[PDB]
């Protein structure tokens, strides 16, 4: 008893001491409660090899995908974003000098803050230099833009505009002379013209992202300045100007943290300098301005925020954007059967420790017990927050704390908590006295489209946006909605981005043509004389018509003609790929067409599939059983291989026939080793490229229905990163030859998050006609014998004409005669087609299927000609007489 009790006390005390050391580390650096403790312990155990730690850095930071290492990985060089953007420390910190994880991580964080503050000071200095001039050099502008990171560039532009207009207000000071306001507006207009000219040319993707961000900011600044000039504001303390977010930069502050202060309306916020990599910049519509004002007032009053309303209006995105503009790291909590009560307590402790913004996306989807539990948690932490709000409590010595995990946890006032709701319901009754509420009833899609379309580089944007937004509203109203349809703001943004890319491709094509022939190349001259309506319509067609049911395509075209009058789209012609596709179709025994013919729908569908696989690296096929999606896929692969000279290799994998663990690899709980899964092993094989498959192209089909339970591993591949995350922790990229696929009957049980990451082509069941399938069957009868087995299947790799094999066996002649005699009954209005149409009206014991009936018929006719062959084998004296064959085949048919 005593011997067992000693071990019981000792092992528990050792575990408690390890936990106390971990908690001391998390007290030395507050960022540490965010990572799970079971992963933090193996992080400590593997401090020398931080390659495994690289996976945990995504949870560690906001957008820092990995940390840059030295050649001996003992001194950190910097941090990389999700794409690979780097920032450089002034004096790099050595992990060997300070082996403690908490010490070197907090050194990294503090020096990151001070170095981005210093480069921000240099940025605002050079942007002041740029803005003080009437004209700006585009080369110097682009040099600065590529020199400095995207968020710092946008923030520097905001600070420069804010100080310009503030100096304008202080310079008038009741004098009523609008000269400095007009000069600021003219400066912003000139910079907008310069950058709109700049974005037209071809740029690196990061430069393009920065240019989009700066147009998004500058249109808002110009609109604010125009509204202020219209309002005729003469004093800097008027509320018409005070309601807009002012940026106050103080370089004279010795401490870098209190250098930047952001004030909107009344609250005096402070910038928490954190690295965000590259984020998405939301356009400052009046709705988002009102949201910013209300959340700023709520945080000033130290209450909560709860923007309620219908989904897809920008609630959690607006909260995230406000957190980005404030510099706080932002977590978005999924509230759909992904509830982890034990983790959320530690997350809340970390939020109280450092300060981070957490938004509960769709809080109405939880069940009562967890609603009550997390409501009690958010209630106690909100009351802890409000312990700082009261003025009767002193602030010079204020250890504001909360009872979290039965522990006194230090709380800083920097954090914020938001709870998104979706009525249609209300907040729980124990939180209504603490959380403000917002009405996100309707976004300003017209202004969103206008600003995004203007940032794409369009000469005209207002009429195109004011057409395309009611166009999408009209399309959602008039189109018979299905499960995979989406006409939301995300769809609008994707359509406009595709339109900008199409316009840039057109610019490149016309420039290359005019360089090939003899003229003078002028990018602006090419730019002004192009139909933006035609470009946008072509983009809508190319990104939406494949995703559309055959019933809805002429309705969509009629809506397009109603909204954009006097303009029509002419589809581009792909002669080389069409000819190669026709040759491959003739080789592989199919039916081809050239539009509005037999097989013309299939041909234009697979051409649309090529367009989608050129635009995006991941697409789906959502035809029913009997839609030809896999065969169109194979035909396109074999045609592209012959056209480009690049070998096409297929990897068809059934996702649900095999287990998900055997598909994505299985982790070893003991004696740790990695067993590769099917798709992961194929991707590892092409990454290694032992047989030189990086020069060739690989397509991978997941031939089976999609579920949210197994596509969570493919979300990290189907996003813009194209980085397959694995429990091993090693990073696998997707080379451009890889184009992942999906072969699904329907998406009745698939998430819209997985829908949004891929394009889709809807192969309607009226694509393969009965005549088409009859042509395939007759071609297979006339070509493929029925007695050679699989030994001669490898013999097909000789010449495709198969010369000298005409008199290989009399079976080929017999079945050719059979195909000839069954030809008149396989017409468009033939007996088989009429009988199939009539039996469609009848009901059977199972569900009738056209290819099922046809396949049974074809198998029995194969057995009929085999019976003729057996009769001839048993009758070597006389062959099978022609009229007897006529009667037998007719009767058997």
């Amino acid at each position: 008893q005593r011997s067992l009790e000693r071990l019981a006390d000792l092992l528990g005390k050792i575990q408690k001491a390890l936990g106390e050391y971990l908690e001391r580390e998390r007290s030395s650096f507050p960022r540490f409660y965010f990572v799970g403790d079971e992963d933090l312990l193996e992080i400590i155990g593997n401090s020398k090899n931080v390659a495994k730690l690289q996976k945990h850095f995504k949870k560690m930071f906001a957008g820092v995908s990995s940390i840059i290492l030295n050649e001996d990985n003992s001194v950190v060089l910097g941090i990389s974003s999700r794409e690979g953007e780097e920032v450089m420390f002034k004096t790099p910190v050595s992990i060997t000098e300070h082996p403690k994880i908490n010490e070197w991580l907090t050194l990294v964080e503090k020096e990151m803050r001070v170095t981005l503050a210093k480069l921000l000071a240099e940025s605002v200095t050079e942007v002041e230099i740029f803005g003080k001039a009437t004209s700006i050099d585009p080369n110097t502008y682009i040099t600065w833009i590529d020199k400095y990171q995207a968020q710092l560039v946008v923030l520097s532009a905001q600070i420069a505009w804010s100080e310009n207009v503030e100096t304008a207000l202080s310079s008038m000071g009741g004098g009523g002379d609008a000269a400095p306001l007009h000069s600021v507006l003219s400066n912003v207009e000139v910079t907008l013209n310069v950058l709109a000219d700049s974005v037209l040319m071809e740029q690196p993707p990061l430069r393009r992202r920065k240019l989009e961000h700066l147009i998004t900011e500058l249109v808002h600044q110009r609109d604010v300045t125009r509204s202020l000039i219209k309002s005729k504001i003469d004093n800097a303390k008027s509320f018409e100007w005070l309601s807009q977010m002012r940026f106050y930069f103080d370089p004279k502050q010795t401490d870098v943290l209190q250098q930047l202060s952001i004030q909107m309306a009344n609250a005096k916020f402070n910038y928490g300098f954190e690295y965000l990599g590259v984020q998405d910049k939301l356009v400052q519509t009046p709705l988002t301005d009102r949201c910013y004002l209300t959340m700023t007032q709520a945080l000033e009053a130290r209450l909560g925020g709860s923007p309620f309303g219908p989904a897809g209006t920008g609630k959690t995105e607006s909260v995230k954007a406000l957190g980005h503009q404030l510099g706080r790291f932002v977590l978005v909590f999924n509230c759909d059967e992904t509830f982890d009560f034990q983790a959320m307590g530690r997350i809340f402790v970390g939020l109280c420790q450092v300060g981070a913004w957490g938004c509960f996306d769709e809080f109405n989807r939880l069940e009562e017990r967890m609603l009550s539990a997390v409501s009690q948690q958010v209630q106690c932490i909100q009351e802890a927050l409000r312990e700082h709000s009261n003025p009767n409590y002193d602030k010079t010595s204020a250890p504001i704390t909360c009872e979290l995990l039965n522990k006194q946890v230090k709380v800083s006032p920097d954090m914020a908590i938001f709870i998104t709701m979706n009525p249609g319901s209300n907040l729980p009754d124990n939180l209504k006295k603490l959380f403000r509420s917002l009405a996100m009833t309707k976004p300003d899609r017209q202004l969103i489209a206008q600003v995004m379309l203007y940032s794409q580089g369009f000469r005209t944007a207002e009429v195109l946006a004011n057409k395309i937004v009611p166009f999408f509203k009209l399309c959602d109203e008039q189109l018979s909605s299905q499960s995979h349809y989406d006409f939301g703001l995300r769809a609008l943004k994707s359509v406009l981005v595709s339109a900008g890319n199409v316009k840039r491709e057109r610019i490149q094509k016309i420039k290359r043509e005019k360089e090939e022939r003899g003229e003078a190349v002028d990018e602006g001259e090419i730019a002004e004389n192009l139909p933006e309506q035609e470009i946008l319509i072509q983009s809508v067609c190319e990104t939406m018509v494949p995703k559309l049911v055959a019933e809805d395509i002429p309705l969509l075209f009629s809506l397009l003609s109603d909204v954009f009058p006097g303009v029509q789209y002419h589809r581009g012609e792909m002669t080389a790929l069409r000819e190669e596709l026709k040759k491959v179709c003739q080789e592989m025994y199919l039916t081809y067409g050239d539009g509005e013919e037999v097989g013309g729908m299939w041909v234009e569908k697979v051409l649309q599939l090529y367009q989608i696989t050129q635009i995006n690296h991941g697409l789906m096929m959502v035809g029913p059983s009997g839609s030809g999606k896999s065969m169109a896929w194979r035909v396109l692969l074999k045609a592209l291989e012959r056209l480009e000279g690049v070998e096409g290799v297929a990897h068809i994998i059934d996702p649900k026939a095999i287990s998900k663990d055997h598909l994505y690899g299985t982790l070893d709980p003991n004696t740790r080793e990695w067993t590769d899964g099917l798709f992961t092993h194929v991707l590892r094989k092409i990454i290694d490229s032992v047989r030189g498959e990086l020069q060739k192209r690989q397509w991978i089909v997941f031939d089976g229905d999609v579920d949210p339970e197994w596509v969570e591993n493919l979300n990290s591949v189907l996003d813009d990163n194209k980085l397959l995350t694995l429990p091993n922790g090693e990073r696998l990229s997707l080379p451009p030859n890889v184009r992942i696929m999906f072969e699904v009957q329907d998406l009745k049980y698939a998430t819209l998050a997985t829908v949004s990451r891929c394009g889709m082509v809807w192969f309607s069941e009226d694509v393969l006609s009965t005549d088409m399938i009859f042509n395939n069957f007759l071609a297979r009868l006339r070509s493929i014998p029925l007695d050679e087995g699989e030994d001669e299947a490898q013999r097909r790799r000789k010449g495709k004409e198969d010369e000298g094999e005409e008199a290989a066996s009399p079976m080929l002649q017999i079945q050719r005669d059979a195909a000839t005699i069954m030809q008149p009954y396989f017409t468009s209005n033939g007996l088989v087609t009429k009988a199939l149409e009539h039996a469609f009206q009848l009901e059977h014991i199972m569900d009738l299927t056209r290819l099922r009936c046809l396949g049974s018929l074809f198998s029995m006719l194969h057995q009929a000609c085999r019976n003729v062959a057996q009769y001839n084998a048993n009758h070597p004296d006389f062959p099978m007489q022609i009229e007897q064959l006529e009667r037998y085949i007719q009767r058997y048919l």
């Binding site: 009344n266 004002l293 007032q297 209450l303 009690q376 009833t441 809506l559 006097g566």
Partner: protein, 935 residues
Amino acid sequence: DLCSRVTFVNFTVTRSSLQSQCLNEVLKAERPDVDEKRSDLLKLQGEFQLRLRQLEKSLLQALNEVKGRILDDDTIITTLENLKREAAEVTRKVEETDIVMQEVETVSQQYLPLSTACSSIYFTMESLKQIHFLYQYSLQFFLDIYHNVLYENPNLKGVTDHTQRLSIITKDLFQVAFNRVARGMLHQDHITFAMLLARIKLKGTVGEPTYDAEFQHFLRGNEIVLSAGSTPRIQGLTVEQAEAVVRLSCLPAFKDLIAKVQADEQFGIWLDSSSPEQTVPYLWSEETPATPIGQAIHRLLLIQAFRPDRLLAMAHMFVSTNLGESFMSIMEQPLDLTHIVGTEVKPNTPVLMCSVPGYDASGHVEDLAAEQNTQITSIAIGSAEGFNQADKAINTAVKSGRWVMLKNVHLAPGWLMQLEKKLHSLQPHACFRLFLTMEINPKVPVNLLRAGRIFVFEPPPGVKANMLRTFSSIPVSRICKSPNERARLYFLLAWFHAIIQERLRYAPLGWSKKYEFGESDLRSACDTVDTWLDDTAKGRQNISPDKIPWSALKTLMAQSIYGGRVDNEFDQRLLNTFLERLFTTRSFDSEFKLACKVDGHKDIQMPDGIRREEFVQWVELLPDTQTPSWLGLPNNAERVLLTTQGVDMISKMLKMQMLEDEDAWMRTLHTTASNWLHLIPQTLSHLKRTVENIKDPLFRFFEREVKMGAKLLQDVRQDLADVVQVCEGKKKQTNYLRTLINELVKGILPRSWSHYTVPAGMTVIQWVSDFSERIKQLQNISLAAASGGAKELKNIHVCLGGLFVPEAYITATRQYVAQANSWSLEELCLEVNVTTSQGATLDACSFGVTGLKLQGATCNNNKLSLSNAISTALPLTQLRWVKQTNTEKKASVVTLPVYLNFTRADLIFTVDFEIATKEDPRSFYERGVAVLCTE
């Protein structure tokens, strides 16, 4: 199996069981002489025989052991005489097994209506659950009422006559039951409970007829349907009153009502009188002089038919003339909590009290404890330490005889359940009362509501009371702080908060929906004003009225504090007009009118004082009269609210009739199913699709809508066929079938039938009526389109009410004219033209719309004017899509929302109307003018 393996015992309560219980209780309690005679009737059996045989057994035990001493003192002969007397006495009792039985039978027959009334009252109290989830009353509660009436009656003192005792005990029972139930009951339902008790006493009393037909018409007079075009026109009254007379005329005593009202000349001054219930005329036909109760019922039917907004007042009058004028006078008084907590609260029953959200009741009990000099501990129920504090406090107080505060316990239903489980099995002190305070929520345990002395606390209405509550909640020092204009700003904010908060009461006219403008919003507004005033003043004693940040306060209260919950653009605009009218520099003038056009002639002049005490004095000197003109609503808003409360009371008491009266449902289901299959149409016809008609937007909408509507119609007809098949018994039912049948029986709207837009909380009969109207319109448009093609479809007049999505109809006509004129959709704007003419010539861009209604205004020559009518029936409305030219906004243009139904929950489109006179567009917004597609 569990049924077969055990035997069943039912200690259940029913009419006969409670009748016999009350009869036994009243005979044991009140009547002494026949009480003793009937206890002697229970002594007719062999109790004395058993005692005598016990004495005989003792004597026999003392008989065998004898040695010549049984002739001791001649005392045995006394016992022999006693036993002979007892034998003769029980023999006489056996001989009297008819006379005494007849006497006690007559005595019990004297007390039969009293026990019938007791059973009816308890069954109504049990049926009170279906009115509201809060009304949970128990058999122990009713027996407490009965014992308090029978035993502790102060009226019975000094009275010896048995008939007088009967009358006193019946009146006291009714009064005490009404008081005890209504103390824990909302103010909107006191009249309902009083009406039920009056019906019970009218049934139980003798000498008065049943009035069963009158009651049935008074309850379900709107359930019958009138033929279209069968209502004639009668002068001196409106259309709705005409159909009300038509519905009323079915009664045998009301046949000559039309002739009487046509021959009556003084009818106008009564129909337009403020209180027609005082001087209601003589209109009922009768052959004998009716009782006061009968004439009250007849005039109540007359008031309900003619002026439904006075239904509450006339029901009050009927309760007064049936059960006493002082019957309801107890409820119109401050609560006497002292007597209740000292006498009528059991020590093991916690005093349960409830309130509407935003209002507390702890101050009442704090004052009660202060005046009762009893120590009470305050515990807040919001966490585990609060649970432990509650546990230790209750286990201390159960012995020490103290009182326990358990604040806002509605957050923990499981804690409430286990606390009631604890309270079922403890021995409490004689002075231990547990005061549970919580808001009215459905998460409170139903058994906890059943096992508690419930109470209801409500905030009284009236702007004066609202501002008094606001100024009492706001501390004096906050307003007293410098500058001196802070008091005036706080008075303005309090007036505005009271105005909006009591504008909530007149929904949907006051607001499109009932927001929660509670105390947190008031605190946020006060903090905002404090911060901005501090920033502007910077410690100065006095600041100029012009230097006040009016723009800051207006924008913040419009977008952040009060406008945060406002999801409607038009409610946001109304809030904006309120803030622009109130928060301005012009308010600080002595001539500022805080509410214009009050009562049509006067104005509420803003007080000129600069002190909190002066403002509070002005508030306390406010007149007790109040009309919606104080809030800015039209003066008919009170009448609309009163008639809404009247129809709500009628429906609530109709729920009582169909549940408490069960002497069944299949027999009524036969008639309802046959009638519904009768008036519902036969079939609908689809429209043929052609390559030329494929471009018709109304054909596209017709295709989608009529596909889903043919699905809906085949479902409805097939389900009605299934219902009547089950009615005839040759078809069984599945779970879906029985749930649908139960919903059709109870009147709850079928969810599978309801997948298009309908008003909330609406009845299946009205659903059948307006759905048959929609199907008739669809048949008309299908027939016209099939007969004429698509050319006349532009000229066909379409009612927006009968359309399923008139928003899609508006988009259809805009894309139709866009296709016709080859214009972009952005280059089109909508212009409205209300035409009083019938079948006017329509342009190529003009359309026909019927059925529109205008609320709170009148339309004349496309120009609006303020009107005192509740609703005006708009004539044929024209929708013209002109090109969106660069036209400036006129000073007399107004944008009106067009809601589909009266609830104003959904929005369709907006119109553009002119103004005839120079009435303020702010006045239009304050009055709340809106357009309704259907009434």
